[PDB]
Amino acid sequence: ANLRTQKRLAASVVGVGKRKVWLDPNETSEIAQANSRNAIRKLVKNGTIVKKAVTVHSKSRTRAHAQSKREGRHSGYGKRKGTREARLPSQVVWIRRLRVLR
Amino acid sequence: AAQKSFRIKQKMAKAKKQNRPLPQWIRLRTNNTIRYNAKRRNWRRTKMNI
Amino acid sequence: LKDVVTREYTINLHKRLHGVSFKKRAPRAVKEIKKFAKLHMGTDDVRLAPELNQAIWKRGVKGVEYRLRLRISRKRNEEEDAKNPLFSYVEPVLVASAKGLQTVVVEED
Amino acid sequence: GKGTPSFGKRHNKSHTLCNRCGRRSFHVQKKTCSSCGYPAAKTRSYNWGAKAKRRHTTGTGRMRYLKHVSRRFKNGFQTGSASKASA
RNA sequence: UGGCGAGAGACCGAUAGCGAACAAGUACAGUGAUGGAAAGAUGAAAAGAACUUUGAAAAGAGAGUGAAAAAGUACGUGAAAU
RNA sequence: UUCUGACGUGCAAAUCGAUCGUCGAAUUUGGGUAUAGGGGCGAAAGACUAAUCGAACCAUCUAGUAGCUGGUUCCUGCCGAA
RNA sequence: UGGUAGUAGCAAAUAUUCAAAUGAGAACUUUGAAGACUGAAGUGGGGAAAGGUUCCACGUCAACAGCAGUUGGACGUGGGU
RNA sequence: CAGGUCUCCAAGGUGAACAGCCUCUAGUUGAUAGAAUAAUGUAGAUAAGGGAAGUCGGCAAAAUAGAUCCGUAACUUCGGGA
RNA sequence: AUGUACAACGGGGUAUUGUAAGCAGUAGAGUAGCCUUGUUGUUACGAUCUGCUGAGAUUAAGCCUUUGUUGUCUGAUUUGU
């Protein structure tokens, strides 16, 4: 059929946007009948429309790189592109040098 | 516009109720020359200028 | 008269997707596999498979592999038939390295 | 720059509907209509606008009262009612 | 040369006559003052095409109404360019 | 700014691309409001005043006037220039 | 109304592919499977000015969407603040 | 109609950074297609040796460029020049 | 159109880059952990190095060659003194 309204209603009902719902292609005649939001809540509950869980953005290489920066690595001059008073300003270091002594 | 006075909306009500074709039964009526509606104002063609 | 033959192949895509623009290679892989199955089985209605479609597009437009193992089945058509009573149906098969394999007639039992 | 990218910037109104003549010629900053002249107590028409008088004179509207005046002259401005004669 | 009610013509006959023979100061254009069209005529009468067949449908082909569809609601005669 | 690149019966009655000015203040801008035609406004180019400006648009006077340009509708006959 | 001419051309914005469903007819509709893009000074969510019903649903494919069309900010009928 | 039109929200990595580059939530996949891939174009490139000899003119490209450390002339309004 | 034919693969040669993946190692700057605390004392971490590895990958789309495997091989149209 023409399932534009069903995908829009399913995105509004489940709450996840239109790019992640899964109107299954086998039961399409059934989804041609479900025209209201109360019928979308039936077709989500039994498993005819599901949620299609989130694509993984692994912050794991990030953790390995930050762990290596904690170890002292990855901080030469060819990983250092801002000035010395822009990476960490001298006024910050001075406040730390003098809120401690005072 | 999206937040209106009343007078402009009143004229939109008239501009809605005029935006329709002929009744189908007038074309059978005796001594008729009116074959269509020569005042169909669309929104993509003619702005009504309020 | 029966002609329900199912075979397997290696298609060499490097000698067919050579020198093509990069944003056209994988659709030309598709249009080329249809021409391949037209060449071999002889029918002119070729259906691919979405498994085979994924197997071409594993690496975007410009990363189609060099050799592929196809499995072409020349099935007979029915049900308000098209202009030929037979059609090809082209699946992939899973192999580790597609280099080295000849053509094989698949027995159906 | 003086053409289509300065017809982009053109999204206000200098005129609104006149209450008197209803024609949308009511200038907002001057607070006076430019077609009929509202709220001046007269209606602006000029003798160089030969067509403008042809658009705004009597008989172009309903004639909600004058339509009945000449007829009411023909009978001599009668008052009261008529009687019943026969049949 | 305005309004109403009248009578007329060695006038115009729809590119003419008023801008307007028609839902004409209308459709429409312009911020506005203002500018402003085009567009009449099937037949006596819709009798405006039942029914069959081809086609998915528009339509065609038969059939039929009509003096006549070389009058079919893109409709009087229907020129020239093409 | 430059390419005097693209385009130049265009995407566009002035845009596209790279390059380039400036980027915290004589900055940029929405809305309201003030100033209007020989007047407005101008860090002045006769620039801008709704694609119109060494003087806007609209209507009327107005069919302005022209010693200047273009056109000036059927035949035959008799005479015929400068 | 022509010849021009079925020519000029419909080339900026990295980009599409496979199978199924509807159908007379799917490069373009719908679903699914991939592949990519904007990459949060977004091709995302709200609005002001402006438009006025375009919002939403059922049906239809003459005209419009400078290709197509069973799709549509179109057409027909209703609903909605 | 590849123009123009005011504002709010604001993720992860590199990175000084709201730069560019890649992904998450979100939204699209729309801008006529198919086949070949001649000339001449538009857009991007790369060139042996020489090096502006081209040309009105190094116009167009190329080359440098981030950070860290050293070193920094004439002139000067003694701030700069850098 | 039944052929020491042709095609799709596979094999061999030629060629291009340059030594793969995986497994192992009294190689490895050092760093910790331990114990009989050593006269390589070991276990773990450790870019890289060595060994199988002139390996692996590509090789015709306009390279060469082939008895291997699987196939294909008459569809349409016109023409006479």
Side-chain angles (χ1 to χ4, degrees), chain A, chain B, chain C residues 3-107, chain D:
Chain A
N2 192 0
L3 299 176
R4 298 280 298 276
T5 304
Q6 282 80 18
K7 184 176 283 290
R8 180 177 58 82
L9 265 58
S12 180
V13 164
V14 186
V16 186
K18 287 173 65 175
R19 68 179 295 173
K20 293 180 182 297
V21 297
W22 188 68
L23 283 74
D24 54 351
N26 292 318
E27 294 291 329
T28 180
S29 295
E30 179 70 28
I31 312 170
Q33 188 177 3
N35 53 5
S36 65
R37 295 167 71 96
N38 199 2
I40 297 300
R41 284 194 292 267
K42 292 194 290 292
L43 271 72
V44 168
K45 180 173 72 69
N46 55 2
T48 308
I49 299 171
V50 297
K51 194 184 284 183
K52 278 178 93 287
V54 174
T55 306
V56 289
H57 185 196
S58 67
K59 294 172 288 295
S60 67
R61 292 183 300 273
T62 294
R63 291 174 189 168
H65 188 271
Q67 181 65 40
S68 64
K69 283 177 68 67
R70 291 177 190 273
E71 293 172 353
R73 273 71 169 172
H74 293 278
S75 296
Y77 296 96
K79 301 297 182 183
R80 179 177 290 125
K81 289 176 70 67
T83 64
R84 189 179 62 243
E85 200 171 359
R87 293 171 64 86
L88 174 58
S90 294
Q91 189 175 6
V92 174
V93 182
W94 176 254
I95 291 169
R96 293 176 185 175
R97 283 183 60 193
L98 184 136
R99 292 189 191 275
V100 166
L101 297 176
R102 187 175 284 256
Chain B
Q3 198 171 9
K4 302 188 284 287
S5 65
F6 179 73
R7 187 182 295 275
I8 318 297
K9 187 180 187 293
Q10 192 183 6
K11 293 179 72 67
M12 297 172 202
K14 186 176 177 70
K16 179 182 177 182
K17 287 187 281 189
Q18 288 178 352
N19 194 2
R20 70 175 296 274
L22 294 183
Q24 293 291 321
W25 55 270
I26 299 173
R27 294 173 62 89
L28 281 79
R29 192 177 66 188
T30 302
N31 297 118
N32 197 3
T33 188
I34 299 168
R35 294 182 183 179
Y36 64 98
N37 192 3
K39 296 178 187 178
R40 289 298 305 275
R41 192 268 316 162
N42 199 6
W43 62 276
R44 297 180 70 81
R45 294 192 293 270
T46 300
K47 307 299 177 184
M48 71 182 78
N49 301 115
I50 310 168
Chain C
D3 296 332
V4 198
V5 184
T6 297
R7 295 184 180 95
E8 291 181 354
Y9 294 99
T10 59
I11 182 171
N12 190 2
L13 284 89
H14 191 191
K15 66 175 285 185
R16 294 174 176 93
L17 300 180
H18 187 271
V20 188
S21 304
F22 287 129
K23 266 65 195 296
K24 289 183 180 178
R25 294 168 78 94
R28 193 174 181 88
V30 170
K31 293 184 178 70
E32 191 67 32
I33 290 170
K34 285 187 181 180
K35 187 175 180 179
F36 187 79
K38 182 177 178 179
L39 174 65
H40 283 284
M41 294 300 110
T43 187
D44 297 334
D45 192 2
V46 179
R47 289 177 173 89
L48 301 178
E51 298 88 2
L52 184 142
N53 192 18
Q54 292 181 358
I56 298 166
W57 297 80
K58 291 299 288 183
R59 295 179 177 177
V61 281
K62 56 184 178 182
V64 189
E65 289 187 356
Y66 292 150
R67 295 179 179 91
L68 288 174
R69 291 288 293 169
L70 304 182
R71 176 180 290 175
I72 306 174
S73 302
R74 186 173 65 193
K75 299 178 184 179
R76 63 184 183 272
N77 197 1
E78 293 293 328
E79 60 191 3
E80 186 179 358
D81 55 352
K83 282 80 179 173
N84 287 318
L86 280 79
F87 66 98
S88 292
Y89 182 75
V90 187
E91 286 184 354
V93 301
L94 292 175
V95 72
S97 180
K99 181 72 174 177
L101 294 174
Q102 295 182 358
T103 173
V104 171
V105 175
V106 173
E107 291 85 3
Chain D
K2 70 179 76 172
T4 190
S6 70
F7 287 164
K9 296 180 172 69
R10 204 179 77 184
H11 61 84
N12 280 316
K13 292 189 290 293
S14 287
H15 291 96
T16 318
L17 303 170
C18 184
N19 289 316
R20 183 189 296 172
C21 65
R23 199 190 167 89
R24 186 183 173 271
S25 296
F26 182 79
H27 196 284
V28 183
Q29 294 183 1
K30 295 179 184 179
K31 289 291 180 68
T32 184
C33 182
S34 64
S35 175
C36 71
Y38 183 76
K42 297 187 176 186
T43 298
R44 60 169 290 281
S45 69
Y46 293 96
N47 293 311
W48 46 264
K51 283 185 180 288
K53 294 181 181 181
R54 194 185 299 168
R55 298 184 185 98
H56 290 88
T57 41
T58 185
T60 60
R62 293 175 61 185
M63 290 186 288
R64 199 166 65 243
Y65 177 72
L66 279 179
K67 186 192 294 291
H68 306 292
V69 171
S70 67
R71 172 181 58 83
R72 198 176 67 188
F73 174 72
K74 180 175 71 68
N75 297 313
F77 305 115
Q78 292 172 351
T79 58
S81 66
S83 296
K84 185 182 289 293
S86 292

